[PDB]
Amino acid sequence: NYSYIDPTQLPYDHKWEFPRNRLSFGKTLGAGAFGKVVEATAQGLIKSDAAMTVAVKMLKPSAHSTEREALMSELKVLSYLGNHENIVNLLGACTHGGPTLVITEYCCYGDLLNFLRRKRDEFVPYKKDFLTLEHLLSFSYQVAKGMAFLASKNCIHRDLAARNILLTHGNITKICDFGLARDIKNDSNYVDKGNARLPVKWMAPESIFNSVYTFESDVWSYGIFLWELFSLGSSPYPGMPVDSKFYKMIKEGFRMSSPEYAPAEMYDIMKTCWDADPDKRPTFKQIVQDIEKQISES
Numbered sequence: 615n616y617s618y619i620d621p622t623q624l625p626y627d628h629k630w631e632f633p634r635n636r637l638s639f640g641k642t643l644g645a646g647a648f649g650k651v652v653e654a655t656a657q658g659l660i661k662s663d664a665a666m667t668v669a670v671k672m673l674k675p676s677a678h679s680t681e682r683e684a685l686m687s688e689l690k691v692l693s694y695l696g697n698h699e700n701i702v703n704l705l706g707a708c709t710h711g712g713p714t715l716v717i718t719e720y721c722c723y724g725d726l727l728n729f730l731r732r733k734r735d736e737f738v739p740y741k742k743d744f745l746t747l748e749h750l751l752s753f754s755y756q757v758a759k760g761m762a763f764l765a766s767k768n769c770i771h772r773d774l775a776a777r778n779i780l781l782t783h784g785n786i787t788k789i790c791d792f793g794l795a796r797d798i799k800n801d802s803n804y805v806d807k808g809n810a811r812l813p814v815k816w817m818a819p820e821s822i823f824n825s826v827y828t829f830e831s832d833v834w835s836y837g838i839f840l841w842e843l844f845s846l847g848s849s850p851y852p853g854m855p856v857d858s859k860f861y862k863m864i865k866e867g868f869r870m871s872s873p874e875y876a877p878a879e880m881y882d883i884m885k886t887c888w889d890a891d892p893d894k895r896p897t898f899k900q901i902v903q904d905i906e907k908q909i910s911e912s
């Protein structure tokens with residue numbers, strides 16, 4: 615389940631331990647078959663008496679031992695990564711006295727995909743809260759920064775997509791992973807492939823055909839995320855169902871054409887992210903340096 619690191623071998627700093635009786639649960643932000651993310655109020659998480667809104671990931675009673683081990687591994691990985699500006703930040707956890715609760719910072723504007731879809735009509739390519747090309751380039755940069763950080767920590771996301779990016783204050787995007795808190799059975803972006811329901815349209819050929827996930831396969835999905843970003847939340851390979859013809863076309867070298875709002879130099883990034891040879895793909899660090907140059911020129 616993890617390519618380079620082994621989360622079961624990662625420690626869990628009890629500095630994160632928070633008493634669950636100090637959490638007041640609110641609305642469900644997202645839910646899957648086995649897990650959910652709930653909005654909560656954490657009393658006494660701040661040094662003063664002040665309460666704060668947090669997001670809490672937990673398992674449902676439908677969950678088995680596999681999901682239980684997975685939520686604990688996720689907590690260890692989040693604790694191991696530590697705080698990064700572009701990654702959703704762990705604030706605490708509840709491991710004693712009941713089911714595992716993973717507590718993170720609450721992100722004001724939800725997932726990037728829904729935000730882009732809500733802002734599709736209030737978009738200005740030129741430089742109320744109008745979305746612009748400057749915002750999209752900044753989101754692309756922040757996601758590449760967060761992913762460069764994850765790769766430096768020998769972490770592979772395996773599900774990089776606009777649906778797994780959160781938007782908070784000051785146009786700050788944060789990489790997250792809904793995982794078990796996403797209803798993948800009813801999400802048309804996850805296809806039935808063998809025993810699994812997989813996000814095939816975001817997946818590198820080697821992940822589809824050989825089940826290999828690497829730094830380079832995350833780069834491929836970043837290319838797809840770029841496409842979704844500069845199409846303002848449109849589904850990738852539009853009008854194309856995931857079938858035999860799709861797998862054939864990907865293996866044969868078919869690639870999406872540029873989305874409507876992508877600068878040529880961003881599309882250049884996408885093309886290289888989609889190289890059939892993983893060794894010819896750029897690293898996230900190379901991508902950061904490229905976008906940085908584009909922002910400076912702008």
Ligand SMILES: COc1cc(Oc2ncnc3cc(OC)c(OC)cc23)ccc1CC(=O)Nc1cnn(C(C)C)c1
Pocket residue numbers: 643644651669670671688691692695701702716717718719720721722723724725771780789790791792
């Ligand atoms: C509590 O934990 C989570 C909470 C999440 O959801 C939200 N978190 C904050 N604010 C939200 C605001 C919303 O609307 C206002 C919201 O509306 C649907 C969901 C929100 C999403 C994911 C997780 C776990 C997680 O990211 N784990 C993980 C594993 N690996 N990584 C690596 C670093 C990539 C991250």
